[PDB]
């Protein structure tokens, strides 16, 4: 149409101009009108400077710059901003930083034209690490706040410290996870920290099993809204939760030692046919978790 011609004639004057102070005032006005998809389509290089200079102090503008790159398929450049934004000093909630690192991990998982394979994985590894930590920090804060053992005065002091940037595993372990005797989250920290120590890893597994057995036996004794599960069932849940979440690392999930422990617990605490349980529930647990048959039989031997 000639209507469509006068449209293209008009937006060529605008997009081609060399006055970038005009472009900035134009991009600022496009947002105020909610014309989001318009900013993205612009191929001028004055838009990149505007969005980059605004991403530095506005989370919701760094959002578009990341959208700008991902519609153009510059996936690495987006994860590069999403990661550098989660590590920022900006006022961003922890659960948003979990999204950022989760998107960054995806955008840095696929090849992007021009950028190396090493720099692609160099960023995916960094983002994945932080996401694992941030998930611990989130699951930790969630449990600390709901912990009756903690004073309501301290809970506010924690929430301000945790609900924001991602802290070191050292800070998460000492001043919080280990004190509260959160044995399951202590193991996730060992895994996320590549913590080399066979004993303490095993000692923590023993405490995690016992504390789990207790919470389930107290429940069964009380029944408590629905019929609670028998002890080994809740213990089995707390291992599966680690197994999927650990991705079955040999350091914090050593079948060489842990399987005897679970089999020992199944005897010393009488989780067997007496209570209607499958006597081979320790074997059934590890096999279905992905442990090789050739190894399980090697341990029972």
């Amino acid at each position: 149409t000639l209507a469509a011609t006068k449209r293209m004639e008009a937006y060529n004057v605008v997009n081609d101009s060399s006055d970038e102070v005009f472009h900035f005032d134009l991009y600022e006005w496009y947002i105020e009108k909610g014309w989001t998809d318009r900013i993205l389509s612009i191929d001028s290089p004055h838009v990149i400077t505007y969005l980059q200079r605004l991403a530095e102090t506005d989370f919701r503008h760094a959002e578009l710059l990341c959208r700008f790159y991902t519609t153009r398929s510059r996936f690495f450049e987006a994860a590069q901003v999403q990661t550098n934004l989660a590590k920022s000093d900006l006022n961003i909630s922890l659960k948003d930083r979990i999204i950022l690192l989760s998107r960054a991990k995806g955008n840095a998982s696929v090849n992007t034209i021009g950028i190396s394979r090493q720099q692609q994985q160099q960023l995916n590894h960094e983002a994945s690490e932080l996401l694992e930590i941030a998930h611990i920090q989130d699951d930790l804060l969630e449990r600390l706040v709901a912990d009756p053992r903690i004073p309501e005065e301290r809970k506010a002091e924690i929430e301000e410290f945790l609900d924001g940037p991602i802290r070191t595993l050292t800070d998460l372990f000492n001043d919080y996870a280990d004190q509260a005797n959160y044995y399951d989250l202590c193991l996730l920290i060992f895994h996320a920290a590549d913590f080399h120590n066979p004993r303490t890893i095993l000692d923590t597994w023993n405490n995690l099993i016992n504390q789990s057995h207790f919470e389930a036996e107290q429940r069964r004794e009380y029944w408590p809204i629905a019929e609670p599960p028998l002890p080994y069932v809740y213990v089995s849940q707390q291992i599966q939760l680690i197994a999927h979440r650990t991705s079955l690392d040999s350091l914090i999930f050593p079948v060489n030692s842990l399987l005897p422990v679970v089999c020992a617990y199944a005897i010393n605490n009488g989780q067997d046919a007496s209570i209607g349980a499958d006597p081979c529930w320790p074997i059934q647990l590890f096999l279905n978790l992905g442990v090789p048959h050739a190894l399980v039989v090697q341990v029972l031997e």
Binding site: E153, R154, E157, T168, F173, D175, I189
Partner: peptide
């Protein structure tokens, strides 16, 4: 990088100041 230090912490079960 993890460093356990049971020595000096902050009592998780006591308010501040």
């Amino acid at each position: 990088k993890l460093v356990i230090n049971k020595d000096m912490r902050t009592d998780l079960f006591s308010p501040p100041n």
